[PDB]
Design a binder for this molecule. Structure first.
Ligand SMILES: NCCN[C@]12C[C@H]3C[C@H](C[C@H](C3)C1)C2
Ligand SMILES: NCCN[C@]12C[C@H]3C[C@H](C[C@H](C3)C1)C2
Lengths: 325, 325
C-alpha cells in the first residue's frame, strides 16, 4: 500500500504537470513526451526513502493523534514527490558538474525539476492553510543544501579545513537537512502537528542520522570494491574532506601526514593505493566501528526524549533510523 | 532618488543575506567575502530596467490611488532586486551553457542566486499579506522562463518550427514574462492594486513590448558590428530561430531557401556572410522597420484601454515602453 500509493500519485502528478504544459504553456506533443521521458528518467529508479518517510510520518500522526485521512495521506505523497523531484534536481546538477545542446538540455532539466516542486505544491495545496509555511521551509532547506554544496566543493581550497567539526558542517548542510529533516517536517505539516514537536531534538536526530549515514558512505567509498558499491570510489582522487581523511590526520605521524599530503587528491592508481595503505595502517576501519556505535547510541537516546511529548512521531523516526542503521 | 534608493536597498539586502549566512549557516569570513564578490559581480553593472520598473509602478499607484508610502516603496525595491537576482541566475546558467571547481562554483552560484530571491522575500515580506501570492506568481514566471528556454534551445531539432507563431512563443515565454510582465505585476502587488487592473491588456502589452524588443535585438545581432553591439553576433552560427530567419523563409525563393538551408548554422565566416547576403537581398531591414511600426501602434493603442480603468498604472507602462522604443 505505501509504495503503490506513492506511485499512483506520481502518475497523477506527472499527468497534471504535462497537461498543464499542453493546455497553458502551448507545449507541442513531441516536447511533452520528451519531458515525460526526462521526468521518468531523473525521478524514478531510486529507493524513495525520502518520499516514503513523509508517508510514514503522516500515517502515524493520524492513527496516533475519515475524509481528513484521505486528504492527509494524499498530501504526504505529494510532499514526498516534492523531495524526490528536489533530489532529481540535485543529481542533474551534479552530473553537469562532471553550442552543445545536451548540456543546454541538462541545465534546462535541472531548472524544470526544481520548478516542478513549486508547480506541484501550488496546485495540490492551493487551498491548504499550510501552503506558505510549506514553501518557506522547503525553500529554506533547498538553500541550506546549496550552502552545504559550497562548503563541500571548496573544502580543499581557500588541509586546514580537514577537521571533524567542518566535516559535520558539510554533512549537516549538504545532506542531513534535505534527506533526514525535511521528510520529517513535511509529514508534520500535512498532519498539522508542526508546533506539537520539539524541533531541537528532531533537528539533532536528523543531523546525527545523516552523520551516521555519511561516515558509512565514506568508508564504503574507499574500501568497497566498485562492483559491490555500485560505483567507482572517487573521494581520494577528488581530495574530498571525508571522514577517513579527517580521522586519519588527527592520529597520523608527521611523516605519515607528509605521505598523505603528497598522495591525496591524485588519479594515479599508485598514489590512491598509498592513501588506502595509510588508512589501513592507522586502523581507521576499527575506529569506524566504534564511531558509528557512539552515534547509534546518541540516536537511540534522543528518540526517547522525542516520544515523551510526541509518541507517534517517534515510531516513524525509528523506522527512518532503521533504514540507515 | 530612484536609482540611489535602489542601491541603498541593495546594500541592505546584501547585508541581511551575508549576515544570515554568518549567523545562522556557520559561514566563515573568507566564504562570506567570496559570496559578497560573487553577488556584486553577477547582480551589478546592468541597467536595472526590470528592477526600476517595479519602483516606477509603485510610485505611480501611491500618488494616484505617509507611513504606508515608505513601506510600499521599500517593498518595491526588494521586489526589483528579486527580479535582478533572478536575471543574474539566468545569466550564470547561460554562461555554463557556453574535477573542475570553476564549473562547480558557477553551478553553485546559479543555485544560490535563485535561492536568494526566496530568502530576501521571506525576510522583508514575512509579515505582508501578499507574501504567498507574490512567491506563487514569481515562481510561475520563473517556470515560464525555463519553458521558454526549452523552446529556444530545441527550435532547430525534433526548419519546420521556424515560424512566426513559434518565434513569438519563444519570445513570450523566454523573455517577455519575466522582463516585461513580472516587473509590472510586482509593482501592483506591493501597491495592493492587483485585482484593480485588466490583466488581459497588461499581459498583451508585455508580450508585445518583449516582441518589439526582441526583433530589434535580432536585427542588431546580425548587422550591428561587434564593437557597437557590445558583443559578437552569434545567431546565424547557432542556427537560432530569429526574426530574420523566419521572415526570410516566408519571402524567399525555392533556391534561396536551399542556399539558406545549406549556409545556416555554421561558424564558417563565408557561410555566415552568405546568410547576411541573403537577408539583405530580401530587404529584411526594410520589413523590420514596417514590422516595428505596426507593433508600436498596437502598443500605443492598448495603453489607452488600460488607462480607461487604470489611469496611474498606464503612465509607468508608457515609461517602460519608452525604455524599449
Ligand atoms: N551521466 C548520466 C547521463 N544521464 C542524463 C539523465 C538526465 C539528466 C542529464 C541529461 C540527460 C537526462 C542524460 C544526465
Ligand atoms: N564568461 C563570464 C565569466 N564570469 C563568471 C561570473 C560569475 C558567474 C560565472 C562563474 C564566475 C562568477 C565567473 C561566470
Amino acid at each position: 500500500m505505501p509504495m503503490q500509493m506513492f506511485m499512483q500519485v506520481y502518475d497523477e502528478i506527472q499527468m497534471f504537470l504535462l497537461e498543464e504544459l499542453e493546455l497553458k504553456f502551448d507545449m507541442d506533443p513531441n516536447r511533452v513526451r520528451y519531458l515525460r521521458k526526462m521526468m521518468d528518467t531523473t525521478c524514478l529508479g531510486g529507493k524513495y526513502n525520502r518520499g516514503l518517510t513523509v508517508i510514514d510520518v503522516a500515517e502515524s500522526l493520524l492513527s496516533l493523534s475519515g475524509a481528513r485521512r484521505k486528504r492527509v495521506l494524499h498530501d504526504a505523497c505529494v510532499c514526498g514527490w516534492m523531495i524526490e523531484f528536489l533530489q532529481a534536481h540535485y543529481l542533474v546538477e551534479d552530473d553537469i558538474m562532471d553550442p552543445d545542446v545536451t548540456v543546454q538540455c541538462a541545465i534546462n532539466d535541472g531548472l524544470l525539476l526544481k520548478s516542478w516542486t513549486h508547480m506541484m505544491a501550488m496546485h495540490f495545496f492551493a487551498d491548504r492553510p499550510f501552503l506558505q509555511d510549506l514553501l518557506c521551509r522547503f525553500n529554506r532547506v533547498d538553500y541550506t543544501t546549496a550552502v552545504g554544496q559550497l562548503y563541500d566543493v571548496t573544502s580543499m581550497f581557500d588541509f586546514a579545513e580537514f577537521t571533524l567539526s567542518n566535516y559535520k558542517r558539510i554533512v549537516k548542510y549538504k545532506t542531513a537537512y534535505y534527506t533526514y529533516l525535511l521528510p520529517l517536517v513535511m509529514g508534520l505539516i500535512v498532519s498539522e502537528a508542526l508546533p506539537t514537536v520539539d524541533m531541537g531534538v528532531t533537528e539533532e536526530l536528523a543531523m546525527l542520522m545523516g552523520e551516521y549515514f555519511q561516515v558509512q558512505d565514506d568508508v564504503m567509498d574507499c574500501f568497497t570494491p566498485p562492483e559491490r558499491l555500485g560505483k567507482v570510489g572517487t573521494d581520494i582522487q577528488d581530495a574530498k574532506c571525508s571522514w577517513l581523511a579527517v580521522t586519519f590526520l588527527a592520529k597520523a605521524s608527521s611523516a605519515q601526514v607528509a605521505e598523505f599530503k603528497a598522495n591525496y587528491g591524485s588519479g594515479d592508481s599508485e598514489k590512491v593505493a598509498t592513501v588506502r595503505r595509510l588508512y589501513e595502517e592507522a586502523d581507521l576501519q576499527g575506529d569506524y566501528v566504534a564511531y558509528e556505535a557512539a552515534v547509534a547510541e546518541q540516536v537511540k537516546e534522543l528518540i526517547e526524549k522525542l516520544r515523551l511529548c510526541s509518541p507517534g512521531f517517534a515510531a516513524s523516526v525509528e523506522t527512518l533510523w532503521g533504514k540507515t542503521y
